[PDB]
């Protein structure tokens, strides 16, 4: 009996705790014998579970193309994801356009506004003594951050979330395409507006940019817009929700982060290893052998990062969250040329999220009368995290 045969990142068996982690652990155990397995899901594809096997695939850009980065493909109409859905040299040229504003020295400029924002969000419910940490904080912190990066109105998080849902989760493909078409319409307007009155934001920047003497097509710009929006409203929101969930019941982890704030960055790294929501696909472009398996052009490999992150040959006590873990060479933010662009910014954002929350609400728990909900997908993490806590006081009247 092989767990690879019906492995499906959108349909992962959930254990009693609410998460797919029992299943991830079982699959990790099997992968010690079989690091790469065939799944009959999505018409048939390779599932890459072993840590060193994922490293081998991800370093091989000659045989594995990022044209298959989403599998099954995200609903983005005729548009593609900039950087993430491209290979070199096209890929490298586009990333260079936004390398500078995503560098650590540039993104640190947001840190104090991130603290203020997180605190203002906490204000909204602290007097109430209950709330969904996902909808209330985990979703909102990166949505607002993302809106600032894209030069969008920060109060329209619900609109941006509807678009993201269409791209990633809506099942009816007519609706999904229709709703992605709305994004495109809003994106065209914004681009036209930044064209005449540019600002400091990333969109303004890329609109004013030039590759090989030529300005980018509108479709390219829409691609930039789309992936950046995804990085925030999907990936970060789900990661932060899972973290809030863990802190809600794991009183031992919680008291330590409060007692050792100097440990928070390292714990964020460990949390990324443990609750890293993402998996990515690769399109096989030439015959290639990895370990025991020979893959063929046209086939797709899903890189199951969460399983690699629990590989006993790469991490000691992989099933434990050890906040002092170092080094921690997890794959939650990718590796190689497609390594997460947000990287340092997401670390700072997670650090601030956690620090201010524990500072304001050091005691809380899961709501016994409302259900948690895990969202399965290529990006997987908690969607609803209802909590209760002793009523507090706002900082800002
Ligand atoms: C917890 C939050 C996040 C996680 C877990 C995550 C995960 C990842 C992973 C695993 C990759 C590798 C893709 C591959 O190998 O094909 C990647 C790439 C990428 N990420 Fe994210 N991400 C997060 C947040 C963000 C944010 C906030 C942004 C931007 C605002 C962003 C922008 C990008 C871009 C542009 C790429 C492609 C870079 C390239 O192709 O060179 N991400 N991400
Ligand atoms: C899952 C992940 C990491 O996020 C996006 C936005 C970028 C790369 C892939 C696919 C889509």
Swiss-Prot record:
Homodimer. InterPro entries: Cyt_P450, Cyt_P450_B, Cyt_P450_sf. Substrate binds at residue 235. The record marks 235 as: Controls regioselective substrate oxidation. Pfam families: p450 (PF00067). Transmembrane segments: none annotated. Belongs to the cytochrome P450 family. It catalyses: 1,8-cineole + reduced [flavodoxin] + O2 = 2-endo-hydroxy-1,8-cineole + oxidized [flavodoxin] + H2O + H(+). This is 1,8-cineole 2-endo-monooxygenase. GO terms for biological process: carbazole catabolic process. Involved in the degradation of cineol (eucalyptol). Catalyzes the initial hydroxylation of cineole exclusively at the pro-R carbon to give the (S)-6beta-hydroxycineole. Cineole is the natural substrate of CinA. It comes from Citrobacter braakii. Pathway: Terpene metabolism; 1,8-cineol degradation.
């Amino acid at each position: 009996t092989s767990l690879f045969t019906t492995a499906d990142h959108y349909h992962t068996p959930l254990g009693p705790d609410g998460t797919p982690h029992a299943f991830f652990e079982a699959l990790r155990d099997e992968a010690e014998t079989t690091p790469i397995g065939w799944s009959e899901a999505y018409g048939g594809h390779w599932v890459v579970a072993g840590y060193k096997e994922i490293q081998a695939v991800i370093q091989n850009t000659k045989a594995f193309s990022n044209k298959g980065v989403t599998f099954p493909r995200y609903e983005t109409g005729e548009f593609e994801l900039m950087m993430a859905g491209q290979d070199d040299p096209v890929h490298k040229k586009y990333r260079q356009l936004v390398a500078k504003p995503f560098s650590p020295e540039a993104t640190d400029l947001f840190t104090e506004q991130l603290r203020q924002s997180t605190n203002d969000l906490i204000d909204a419910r602290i007097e109430l003594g209950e709330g969904d940490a996902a909808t209330w904080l985990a979703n909102e912190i990166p949505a607002r951050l993302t809106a600032i990066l894209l030069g969008l109105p920060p109060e329209d998080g619900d609109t941006y979330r509807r678009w993201v849902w269409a791209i990633t989760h809506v099942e009816n493909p007519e609706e999904g395409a229709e709703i992605f078409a709305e994004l495109v319409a809003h994106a065209r307007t914004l681009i036209a507006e930044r064209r005449t009155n540019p600002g400091n934001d990333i969109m303004s920047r890329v609109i004013m940019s030039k590759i090989d003497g030529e300005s980018l097509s509108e479709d390219d710009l829409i691609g930039f817009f789309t992936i950046l929006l995804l990085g925030g409203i999907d990936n970060t929101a789900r990661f932060l929700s899972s973290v809030f969930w863990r802190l809600a019941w794991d009183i031992e982890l919680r008291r330590r982060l409060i007692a050792h704030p100097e440990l928070i960055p390292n714990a964020v790294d460990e949390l990324l290893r443990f609750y890293g929501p993402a998996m990515v696909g690769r399109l096989v472009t030439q015959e290639v052998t990895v370990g025991d398996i020979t893959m063929k052009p046209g086939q797709t490999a899903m890189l199951w990062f969460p399983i690699a992150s629990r590989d006993r040959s790469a991490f000691d006590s992989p099933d434990n969250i050890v906040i002092e873990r170092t080094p921690n060479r997890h794959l939650s933010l990718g590796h190689g040329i497609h390594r997460c662009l947000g990287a340092h910014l997401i670390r700072v954002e997670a650090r601030v999220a956690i620090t201010e929350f524990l500072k304001r609400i050091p005691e809380f728990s899961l709501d016994p009368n409302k259900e948690c909900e895990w969202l399965m997908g290529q990006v997987a993490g908690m969607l609803h995290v209802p909590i209760i806590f002793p009523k507090g006081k706002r900082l800002s009247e």
